[PDB]
Amino acid sequence: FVIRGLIRQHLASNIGVAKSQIREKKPIVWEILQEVMQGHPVLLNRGIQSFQPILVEGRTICLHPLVCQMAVHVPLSLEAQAEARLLMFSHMNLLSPAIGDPISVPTQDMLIGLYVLTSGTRRGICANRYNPEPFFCNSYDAIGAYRQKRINLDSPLWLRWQLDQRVIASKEVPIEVHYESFGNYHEIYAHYLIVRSVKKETLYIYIRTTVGHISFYREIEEAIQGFSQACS
Amino acid sequence: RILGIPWGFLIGAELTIVQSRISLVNKIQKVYRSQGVQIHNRHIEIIVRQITSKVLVSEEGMSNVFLPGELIGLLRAERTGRALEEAICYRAVLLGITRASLNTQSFISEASFQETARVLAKAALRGRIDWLKGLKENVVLGGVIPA
Amino acid sequence: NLVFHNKVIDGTAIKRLISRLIDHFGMAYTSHILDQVKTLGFQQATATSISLGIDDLLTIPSKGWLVQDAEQQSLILEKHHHYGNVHAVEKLRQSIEIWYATSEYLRQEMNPNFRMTDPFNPVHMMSFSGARGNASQVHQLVG
Amino acid sequence: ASLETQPFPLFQSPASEESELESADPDFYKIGYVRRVRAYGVEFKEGPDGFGIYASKDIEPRRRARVIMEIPHELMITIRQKHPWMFFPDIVPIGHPIFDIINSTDPERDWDLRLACLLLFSFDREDHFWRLYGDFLPAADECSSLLLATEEDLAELQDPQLVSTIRQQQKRVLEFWEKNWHSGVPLKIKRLAEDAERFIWAVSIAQTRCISMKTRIGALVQDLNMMIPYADMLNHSFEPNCFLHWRPKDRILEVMSNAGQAIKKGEEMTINYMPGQKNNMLMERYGFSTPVNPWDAIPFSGDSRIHLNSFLSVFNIFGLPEEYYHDSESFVDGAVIAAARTLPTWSDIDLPPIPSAERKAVKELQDECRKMLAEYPTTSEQDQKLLDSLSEARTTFATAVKYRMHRKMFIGKIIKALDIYQERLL
Amino acid sequence: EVAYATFENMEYGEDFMKPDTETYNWVIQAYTRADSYDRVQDVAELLGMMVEDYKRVQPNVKTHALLVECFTKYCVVKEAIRHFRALKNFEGGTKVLHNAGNFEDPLSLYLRALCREGRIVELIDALDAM
Amino acid sequence: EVWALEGFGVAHILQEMLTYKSAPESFRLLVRELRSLALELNHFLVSEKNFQINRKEV
Amino acid sequence: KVMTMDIERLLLSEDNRFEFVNSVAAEATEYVEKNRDEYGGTKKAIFHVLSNRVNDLGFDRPEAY
Amino acid sequence: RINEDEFHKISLLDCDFFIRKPPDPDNDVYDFREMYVTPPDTDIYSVPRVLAPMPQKYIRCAMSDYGCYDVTEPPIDAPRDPLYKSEREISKVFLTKHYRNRRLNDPEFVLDFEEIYVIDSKTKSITRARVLVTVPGGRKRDRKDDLLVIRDNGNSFKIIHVGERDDPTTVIEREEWTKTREDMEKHLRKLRDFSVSNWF
Amino acid sequence: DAGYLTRRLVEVVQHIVVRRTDCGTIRGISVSPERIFIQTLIGRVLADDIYIGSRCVAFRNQDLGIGLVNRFITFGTQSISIRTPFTCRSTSWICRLCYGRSPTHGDLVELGEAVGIIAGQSIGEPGTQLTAEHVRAPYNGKIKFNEDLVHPTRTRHGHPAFLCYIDLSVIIESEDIIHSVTIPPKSFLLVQNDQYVESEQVIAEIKERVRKYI
Amino acid sequence: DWFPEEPFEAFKEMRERKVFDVSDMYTIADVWGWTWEKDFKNK
Ligand SMILES: C[S@@+](CC[C@H](N)C(=O)[O-])C[C@H]1O[C@@H](n2cnc3c(N)ncnc32)[C@H](O)[C@@H]1O
Ligand SMILES: [Zn+2]
């Protein structure tokens, strides 16, 4: 395909000249090799799965950790290249067929990272020496306060959950409610607070959470948004 | 004895084969389940369908249609038992894996598996036709895979 | 779309999440969502550390008493085996079974001990999340 | 915006009384967009004739048909066309009295009553999409379906057979309501249609908006009658630029613009509700008529006949009788195609038309058409006057007037067609 | 095999393409006149499938004639006599089984089978049917 | 790997990997050695149009 | 990056994945027969087929994205 | 049986209560005699278990729900079924008298926390809350500064001065602490040395 | 062992391909009564309708989704009849309905899918992975029980013990309160009427034939 | 799970499980209407 590329650019007049330039390994050869590799898939074989190669520095083949002496193969015909790209990609095969079990699930460091990411607050006796938190109006204010070292990853905070649908719960009745004489009341729960009134309506939920939990939710929401950006 | 020669063989095969299927699906999947290595039954059931696929014609089944000891599919045996009066008789057989292969009509799938010389000798004496279908017998011929 | 968790990601919980994502969005979204959660996991693992030290491992504190118990019984039985009160098969079966019993207890009290008394212990998080080291392997280090 | 109640279609457009296509309320699209509806290159517009879909951009031609809309199955309503009643959004709880009522319908005569029961139940089922969508359905005073008419309108319909069929439909509906909304029904039924007007409205909507298709729900290939909350806003045409199509993997109804057709900004996106039904059938079910209806018929009994093939060629009509179409090669339209399907006609292998006897036949059939027009008390343009100015926009009455007018206008086009055919036969 | 491929296309297709009696006749004819191999088990399978289709397929003259052809070209006379005893009820059944005297002659083969197998009380019935 | 590729149904890659990347000449060897054992491994294909029994080049 | 969502869209469009991929291979080989421009550099016939088909779906993707 | 045209349909989780109402522009007034309970849509009625003295006169009340949330989190089928569902489960309702039956817009509008009626979905029952008042002044105190705390699954009611109100943070912290203290004792008790150890 | 098993299974089922939409089978495998009752149904197709009274709840050749199985187990509809591969009319190929939901999609399995070899692999490769309770004193204190209620025995270890075939209540007089423990029938109580017991000490316990040489 | 050892109870299970029932017990003499064959076979 490098020879065919050198013919396509007319930089070699015959296949022997193309082979001679390939032997000379001049930068032109690597530019045409980058042109050839662009959009051409290859099979990797341990266990046999196909990927888009990208020309990389060094000499040892580089593989993605979740897809991880691998052998390498080029599909030669156009029908084979089509079948490879449309059937044989990891995108097409995220499920193990034996029951339909997701293969690529976060594992090793990432999972324990996510575990710590989602460990969040120290609870109760582990958090206060004796028996007896900021509010953030949106999650980017909380992340900003974390970056500015006003709060730590483990530390409890309140986020205004103005998307006041989709509140998570444990089927637990309110741990406490406060009613003001003027008919506002606050419901306090082990995980969140709701301010609502007999006149007017619910003002806001405030969820008691951590920078870690916020980041876990936000980076998935922003991954969905980043993918669906192309839907525009 | 209870159902006589027109039906007793057919329903005896049916009851044997369904009991066997239930027993094999249980005894096999019970291992995986007790080991916690879960699997869907639809993968086991194709193998058990092959193990219980055949019946054999017994001596009292000697006929010009089927000879004794011949192995025929359960569908073939049921349908010919409905259709013909020609002394049809058969009994279910639990064809083990290594005997479901070497009794798979595409002779290349037999020969390239095991007993290659014996398979080829019989099939050449039988003049057998492998009407090429299925995958193992197609990759040898370098085909497009009938799948 | 997805519910806010406010709860720790167990390996079973993330298996549920990823399966539900594949079933809801198909491959199209989930192959990006999971590939970004990779980077999130790497980031938070790098900001943390899961380093293991000689006193990050954490022998269950009553092990000494339990071993002394199993030791004293064995000594008494060995004494009584010399006296001809106990035959060799009973002594053998004690030597097997009382130490198997102790080893099992020591395992069944390893996880509660971490979760109640050192929740953020490295090998606790390693085994309870399922990253590396089965509970048996952690116990064979610790217990 | 996954909440709220009472969004409505601004009634500034249905204010034609003093004497045109403003955008629909953005919430009308938003309630879909939040629920994975997508409109591509089209806009909902609100005329005094209600909603329509219009192209908001010029769309280039494409080799396959091009998607213009996607509606997800979760927002639809469905009844099985054949006896074993099942609901694939499965709104109705098992053992709900609605299932007993819906079973008491005739398997094939009363599909509209079944759909009306589902529609009403879907207005009662909170946080079903139609709880919000019902505000955008035409109310009982603005629906065109003649099930809401009365004798004051049907006297203006002047079509006794169609009057009789409308009367039978109304009788059937009201008898069903009286039988199944008697005082003994549970409150969770009586609250669906506490009066006859609510039920006859629901039936009129079910009739005017029922799509039907063969579909695949997973493995099950099946016949459904269904309501699709944004494909039912497509207006009828017998020359449609779009068609509905089903995707079973993600259970999407596509609205597809026809392959190889370009379309223009402001063009109405239309579909062929039922192919091959006379205007009286469109009045019976949907409650409208169109003058270019290429399947309409005329009660000719004449032995005068015209050379069919010459009638085609003088108007450059092409194709088989099931297929007749017109091309670029300009008054020729669906009414002339209807004429070719309807006039007493003769044909022979190659034999030419008698230039004299065809003019004689033209004269005879023209005087037949003239006496047919003379059977009405008024001309076409008198009804045009009675529609360019009108007392109160009484929708059923205006629909009956549109019907009569369309028929006369048609027969007029028949006269003009025979005139131009004779002249252009030279 | 090339006929049975179409039959297998039909029998496991949509209802509008399910085999009819003629489809069974043509595939039984294909098997019974095969050049090179024993087809009796296939013909018996096809017959059993036709019986399994009893709600939709009923036999005709040509079906019984082809089956008598099969069960007499191969020595299966105890079943041939039964199919001929059914063919008896159709006028011209023996004309069809004579098949104008080509593809050998199934009627002659049947009469010879009855002769050499001594089934004369069936042979006189075949002669009366002729 | 053959089992995996044919599991994906990705059989043109399987054909490439098993034939022109190195009837195929190895099937020619197979038939020739059986033909040397005095067995005629004979390959036919049947014309769908004409029923003609075309003998393959083997 | 994005092109595989188009692939998935077309996989979702066509009623058989294998028949879809067969039709893509057919379209590419007929393209490379009806046109004999070399068309083999930074853009590839498979991506061209996917692009043209998603453009038929109405989506603003350029030839080989 | 009974019609609902003049009844408040107080929908709880396990049943709907029907409470007769007089006409008022705000629909704000309750009969507290014509009490009925109905399975969620069964249109069948019986008198609920009144467990307390109830006012035999038309009076006006605010209403609020002591419901939990629950994440139904159902299994999802192929047509993009939503990977979450969450719904309010009204286990209990509070009806709070208005002081002097003042209307919501009156300048001196105050909730009369002395008179709270509690409706329980699962015992199908009505009760009058035995609230405790911590405020100095008995019946003649300024009621604008009163704040009601409800606790113990809505079984405990305490009127406290507005200033005192514990912060939500310290409430949750104190509940976590009083839980984890008992869990930690229940764990440490298995050790031999527990009998000779200090809380530390 | 795993490698041999995989080779043999694939060689047996190399020919099962989804060649047809519907073999037209008129029969099904019956299923009736729990996680196994789920897994045996999910992604099958019904061989026959199911009705709950007059309410039709599922129809022939409909897919079993989780909601339908949940309805079935809610309303007790036994005899759920499903088109398993055993129901199919061919042994040399399978039709997509008799296989049901795809191994890797939400819709039916796909015509041409090598579900045979997929099954063979999916069974062979997991082959690589295949391979009395003690009651203990929860508190320090004094054991108390009426030891006349229980039979004397010699334990497997030669220790004397009591063997009990009743619900026995054992008190532990701890330093704070009279804790208690329930001992089930058929159990070896290793302790005695007034023994001092220490926390986590075992208090009760609830072939080959081999030569031992002295 | 096992079918009964007694054949008749095994037939009752065959009915109840619908693995085999009397409606599948049919043959040509009962299918193509060869009502005469009753008079031939048993004599
Ligand atoms: C499928 S419903 C659409 C609902 C309608 N857009 C509305 O505003 O409620 C068809 C209705 O649109 C109108 N309609 C249908 N076909 C039409 C046509 N060809 N020209 C004008 N109006 C038409 C009639 O009032 C008919 O009841
Ligand atoms: Zn099947």
PDB file of C-alpha atoms in Angstrom, chain D residues 41-205:
ATOM      1  CA  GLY D  41     -35.754  20.177   8.411  1.00  0.00           C
ATOM      2  CA  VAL D  42     -39.453  20.635   9.234  1.00  0.00           C
ATOM      3  CA  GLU D  43     -41.550  23.032  11.301  1.00  0.00           C
ATOM      4  CA  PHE D  44     -44.988  22.766  12.883  1.00  0.00           C
ATOM      5  CA  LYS D  45     -47.158  25.631  11.635  1.00  0.00           C
ATOM      6  CA  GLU D  46     -50.568  26.684  12.924  1.00  0.00           C
ATOM      7  CA  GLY D  47     -53.127  27.776  10.350  1.00  0.00           C
ATOM      8  CA  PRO D  48     -56.859  28.261  10.860  1.00  0.00           C
ATOM      9  CA  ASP D  49     -57.122  24.765   9.355  1.00  0.00           C
ATOM     10  CA  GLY D  50     -55.054  23.552  12.312  1.00  0.00           C
ATOM     11  CA  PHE D  51     -51.539  22.202  12.396  1.00  0.00           C
ATOM     12  CA  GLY D  52     -49.367  21.204   9.486  1.00  0.00           C
ATOM     13  CA  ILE D  53     -45.802  20.135   8.817  1.00  0.00           C
ATOM     14  CA  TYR D  54     -43.888  22.458   6.499  1.00  0.00           C
ATOM     15  CA  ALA D  55     -40.306  22.197   5.306  1.00  0.00           C
ATOM     16  CA  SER D  56     -38.227  24.860   7.047  1.00  0.00           C
ATOM     17  CA  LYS D  57     -35.312  24.416   4.626  1.00  0.00           C
ATOM     18  CA  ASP D  58     -34.767  23.418   1.036  1.00  0.00           C
ATOM     19  CA  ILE D  59     -33.934  19.702   1.115  1.00  0.00           C
ATOM     20  CA  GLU D  60     -31.676  18.415  -1.640  1.00  0.00           C
ATOM     21  CA  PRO D  61     -32.608  15.177  -3.426  1.00  0.00           C
ATOM     22  CA  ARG D  62     -31.132  11.967  -2.055  1.00  0.00           C
ATOM     23  CA  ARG D  63     -30.534   8.493  -3.421  1.00  0.00           C
ATOM     24  CA  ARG D  64     -32.344   6.658  -0.666  1.00  0.00           C
ATOM     25  CA  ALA D  65     -35.367   8.248   0.954  1.00  0.00           C
ATOM     26  CA  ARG D  66     -34.317  10.890   3.480  1.00  0.00           C
ATOM     27  CA  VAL D  67     -35.580  10.896   7.061  1.00  0.00           C
ATOM     28  CA  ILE D  68     -37.575  13.975   7.990  1.00  0.00           C
ATOM     29  CA  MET D  69     -38.969  12.836  11.345  1.00  0.00           C
ATOM     30  CA  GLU D  70     -38.456  10.240  14.079  1.00  0.00           C
ATOM     31  CA  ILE D  71     -41.187   9.408  16.608  1.00  0.00           C
ATOM     32  CA  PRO D  72     -40.402   6.856  19.356  1.00  0.00           C
ATOM     33  CA  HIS D  73     -42.889   4.062  20.024  1.00  0.00           C
ATOM     34  CA  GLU D  74     -43.217   4.941  23.728  1.00  0.00           C
ATOM     35  CA  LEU D  75     -45.264   8.029  22.808  1.00  0.00           C
ATOM     36  CA  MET D  76     -47.675   6.152  20.524  1.00  0.00           C
ATOM     37  CA  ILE D  77     -50.961   4.404  21.222  1.00  0.00           C
ATOM     38  CA  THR D  78     -51.672   1.013  19.651  1.00  0.00           C
ATOM     39  CA  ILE D  79     -54.456  -1.541  19.346  1.00  0.00           C
ATOM     40  CA  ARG D  80     -54.052  -4.874  17.617  1.00  0.00           C
ATOM     41  CA  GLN D  81     -56.063  -4.902  14.405  1.00  0.00           C
ATOM     42  CA  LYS D  82     -57.092  -8.555  14.885  1.00  0.00           C
ATOM     43  CA  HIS D  83     -59.137 -10.078  17.683  1.00  0.00           C
ATOM     44  CA  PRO D  84     -56.598 -10.922  20.448  1.00  0.00           C
ATOM     45  CA  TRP D  85     -56.440  -7.456  21.968  1.00  0.00           C
ATOM     46  CA  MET D  86     -53.006  -6.399  23.228  1.00  0.00           C
ATOM     47  CA  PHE D  87     -51.441  -3.023  23.959  1.00  0.00           C
ATOM     48  CA  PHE D  88     -47.767  -2.590  23.194  1.00  0.00           C
ATOM     49  CA  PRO D  89     -47.196   0.540  25.234  1.00  0.00           C
ATOM     50  CA  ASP D  90     -49.334  -1.626  27.564  1.00  0.00           C
ATOM     51  CA  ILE D  91     -50.838   1.372  29.333  1.00  0.00           C
ATOM     52  CA  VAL D  92     -53.891  -0.534  30.598  1.00  0.00           C
ATOM     53  CA  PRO D  93     -53.326  -2.512  33.824  1.00  0.00           C
ATOM     54  CA  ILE D  94     -54.290  -6.176  33.701  1.00  0.00           C
ATOM     55  CA  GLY D  95     -57.926  -6.644  34.684  1.00  0.00           C
ATOM     56  CA  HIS D  96     -58.827  -2.976  34.299  1.00  0.00           C
ATOM     57  CA  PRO D  97     -62.506  -2.446  33.331  1.00  0.00           C
ATOM     58  CA  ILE D  98     -61.216  -0.779  30.151  1.00  0.00           C
ATOM     59  CA  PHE D  99     -60.321  -4.238  28.870  1.00  0.00           C
ATOM     60  CA  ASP D 100     -63.886  -5.444  29.435  1.00  0.00           C
ATOM     61  CA  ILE D 101     -65.292  -2.388  27.655  1.00  0.00           C
ATOM     62  CA  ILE D 102     -62.847  -2.690  24.747  1.00  0.00           C
ATOM     63  CA  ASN D 103     -63.651  -6.400  24.377  1.00  0.00           C
ATOM     64  CA  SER D 104     -67.342  -5.504  24.041  1.00  0.00           C
ATOM     65  CA  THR D 105     -66.499  -3.886  20.688  1.00  0.00           C
ATOM     66  CA  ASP D 106     -66.963  -5.659  17.379  1.00  0.00           C
ATOM     67  CA  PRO D 107     -63.558  -7.031  16.263  1.00  0.00           C
ATOM     68  CA  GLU D 108     -63.662  -5.131  12.950  1.00  0.00           C
ATOM     69  CA  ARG D 109     -66.614  -2.706  13.033  1.00  0.00           C
ATOM     70  CA  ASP D 110     -65.643  -0.827  16.206  1.00  0.00           C
ATOM     71  CA  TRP D 111     -61.870  -0.296  15.999  1.00  0.00           C
ATOM     72  CA  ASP D 112     -62.555   3.431  16.323  1.00  0.00           C
ATOM     73  CA  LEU D 113     -64.424   2.841  19.588  1.00  0.00           C
ATOM     74  CA  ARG D 114     -61.449   0.822  20.856  1.00  0.00           C
ATOM     75  CA  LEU D 115     -58.990   3.566  19.928  1.00  0.00           C
ATOM     76  CA  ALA D 116     -61.292   6.130  21.564  1.00  0.00           C
ATOM     77  CA  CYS D 117     -61.268   4.077  24.768  1.00  0.00           C
ATOM     78  CA  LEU D 118     -57.467   3.997  24.675  1.00  0.00           C
ATOM     79  CA  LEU D 119     -57.271   7.728  23.926  1.00  0.00           C
ATOM     80  CA  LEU D 120     -59.517   8.587  26.880  1.00  0.00           C
ATOM     81  CA  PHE D 121     -57.655   6.224  29.209  1.00  0.00           C
ATOM     82  CA  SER D 122     -54.404   7.844  28.046  1.00  0.00           C
ATOM     83  CA  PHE D 123     -55.838  11.196  29.050  1.00  0.00           C
ATOM     84  CA  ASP D 124     -56.615   9.700  32.455  1.00  0.00           C
ATOM     85  CA  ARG D 125     -53.241   7.952  32.883  1.00  0.00           C
ATOM     86  CA  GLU D 126     -51.070  10.654  34.453  1.00  0.00           C
ATOM     87  CA  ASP D 127     -47.570  11.172  33.000  1.00  0.00           C
ATOM     88  CA  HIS D 128     -48.477   9.417  29.803  1.00  0.00           C
ATOM     89  CA  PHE D 129     -47.332  11.645  26.949  1.00  0.00           C
ATOM     90  CA  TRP D 130     -50.898  12.102  25.720  1.00  0.00           C
ATOM     91  CA  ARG D 131     -51.749  13.697  29.080  1.00  0.00           C
ATOM     92  CA  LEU D 132     -49.796  16.646  27.666  1.00  0.00           C
ATOM     93  CA  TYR D 133     -50.539  16.037  23.984  1.00  0.00           C
ATOM     94  CA  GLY D 134     -54.335  16.084  24.375  1.00  0.00           C
ATOM     95  CA  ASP D 135     -54.293  19.872  24.627  1.00  0.00           C
ATOM     96  CA  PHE D 136     -53.053  20.002  21.021  1.00  0.00           C
ATOM     97  CA  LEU D 137     -55.801  17.733  19.703  1.00  0.00           C
ATOM     98  CA  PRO D 138     -58.672  19.687  18.096  1.00  0.00           C
ATOM     99  CA  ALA D 139     -61.512  20.283  20.537  1.00  0.00           C
ATOM    100  CA  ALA D 140     -65.063  19.150  19.795  1.00  0.00           C
ATOM    101  CA  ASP D 141     -65.930  22.459  18.093  1.00  0.00           C
ATOM    102  CA  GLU D 142     -62.910  22.513  15.750  1.00  0.00           C
ATOM    103  CA  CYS D 143     -62.618  18.849  14.729  1.00  0.00           C
ATOM    104  CA  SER D 144     -63.612  18.282  11.104  1.00  0.00           C
ATOM    105  CA  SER D 145     -64.991  14.747  11.517  1.00  0.00           C
ATOM    106  CA  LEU D 146     -68.722  14.683  10.759  1.00  0.00           C
ATOM    107  CA  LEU D 147     -69.380  12.523  13.835  1.00  0.00           C
ATOM    108  CA  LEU D 148     -69.701  15.915  15.561  1.00  0.00           C
ATOM    109  CA  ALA D 149     -72.158  17.225  12.946  1.00  0.00           C
ATOM    110  CA  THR D 150     -75.936  17.357  13.229  1.00  0.00           C
ATOM    111  CA  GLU D 151     -78.878  17.478  10.821  1.00  0.00           C
ATOM    112  CA  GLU D 152     -78.296  21.233  10.494  1.00  0.00           C
ATOM    113  CA  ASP D 153     -75.041  20.285   8.741  1.00  0.00           C
ATOM    114  CA  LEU D 154     -76.200  17.121   6.981  1.00  0.00           C
ATOM    115  CA  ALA D 155     -79.015  19.045   5.291  1.00  0.00           C
ATOM    116  CA  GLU D 156     -76.175  21.105   3.811  1.00  0.00           C
ATOM    117  CA  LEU D 157     -74.314  17.907   2.922  1.00  0.00           C
ATOM    118  CA  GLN D 158     -76.948  17.059   0.262  1.00  0.00           C
ATOM    119  CA  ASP D 159     -75.629  13.492  -0.090  1.00  0.00           C
ATOM    120  CA  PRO D 160     -78.300  11.215   1.385  1.00  0.00           C
ATOM    121  CA  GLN D 161     -76.229   8.010   1.355  1.00  0.00           C
ATOM    122  CA  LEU D 162     -73.333   9.719   3.147  1.00  0.00           C
ATOM    123  CA  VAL D 163     -75.810  11.426   5.480  1.00  0.00           C
ATOM    124  CA  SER D 164     -77.198   7.973   6.282  1.00  0.00           C
ATOM    125  CA  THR D 165     -73.744   6.517   6.941  1.00  0.00           C
ATOM    126  CA  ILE D 166     -72.804   9.444   9.204  1.00  0.00           C
ATOM    127  CA  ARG D 167     -76.108   9.019  11.052  1.00  0.00           C
ATOM    128  CA  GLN D 168     -75.405   5.301  11.478  1.00  0.00           C
ATOM    129  CA  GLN D 169     -71.908   6.053  12.792  1.00  0.00           C
ATOM    130  CA  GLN D 170     -73.251   8.568  15.316  1.00  0.00           C
ATOM    131  CA  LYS D 171     -75.987   6.142  16.386  1.00  0.00           C
ATOM    132  CA  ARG D 172     -73.422   3.362  16.864  1.00  0.00           C
ATOM    133  CA  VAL D 173     -71.118   5.579  18.935  1.00  0.00           C
ATOM    134  CA  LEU D 174     -73.881   6.969  21.146  1.00  0.00           C
ATOM    135  CA  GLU D 175     -75.349   3.492  21.676  1.00  0.00           C
ATOM    136  CA  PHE D 176     -71.909   2.239  22.714  1.00  0.00           C
ATOM    137  CA  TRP D 177     -71.482   5.126  25.153  1.00  0.00           C
ATOM    138  CA  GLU D 178     -74.951   4.551  26.615  1.00  0.00           C
ATOM    139  CA  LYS D 179     -74.248   0.825  26.980  1.00  0.00           C
ATOM    140  CA  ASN D 180     -70.779   1.127  28.520  1.00  0.00           C
ATOM    141  CA  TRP D 181     -70.913   4.427  30.447  1.00  0.00           C
ATOM    142  CA  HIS D 182     -74.133   3.714  32.334  1.00  0.00           C
ATOM    143  CA  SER D 183     -74.296   4.779  35.983  1.00  0.00           C
ATOM    144  CA  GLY D 184     -73.075   1.376  37.213  1.00  0.00           C
ATOM    145  CA  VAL D 185     -69.524   1.728  35.862  1.00  0.00           C
ATOM    146  CA  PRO D 186     -66.694   2.558  38.304  1.00  0.00           C
ATOM    147  CA  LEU D 187     -65.642   6.164  38.785  1.00  0.00           C
ATOM    148  CA  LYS D 188     -62.383   5.166  37.055  1.00  0.00           C
ATOM    149  CA  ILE D 189     -64.586   4.685  33.983  1.00  0.00           C
ATOM    150  CA  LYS D 190     -67.279   7.339  34.473  1.00  0.00           C
ATOM    151  CA  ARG D 191     -64.560  10.004  34.726  1.00  0.00           C
ATOM    152  CA  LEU D 192     -63.294   9.074  31.251  1.00  0.00           C
ATOM    153  CA  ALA D 193     -66.427  10.321  29.458  1.00  0.00           C
ATOM    154  CA  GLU D 194     -69.069  11.638  31.854  1.00  0.00           C
ATOM    155  CA  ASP D 195     -71.089  12.867  28.856  1.00  0.00           C
ATOM    156  CA  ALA D 196     -71.758  11.701  25.312  1.00  0.00           C
ATOM    157  CA  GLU D 197     -69.967  14.723  23.831  1.00  0.00           C
ATOM    158  CA  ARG D 198     -66.631  13.667  25.349  1.00  0.00           C
ATOM    159  CA  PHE D 199     -66.923  10.197  23.837  1.00  0.00           C
ATOM    160  CA  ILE D 200     -68.089  11.282  20.384  1.00  0.00           C
ATOM    161  CA  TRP D 201     -65.163  13.727  20.399  1.00  0.00           C
ATOM    162  CA  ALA D 202     -62.748  10.947  21.344  1.00  0.00           C
ATOM    163  CA  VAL D 203     -64.126   8.685  18.596  1.00  0.00           C
ATOM    164  CA  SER D 204     -63.909  11.499  16.037  1.00  0.00           C
ATOM    165  CA  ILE D 205     -60.254  12.014  16.965  1.00  0.00           C
TER     166      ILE D 205
END
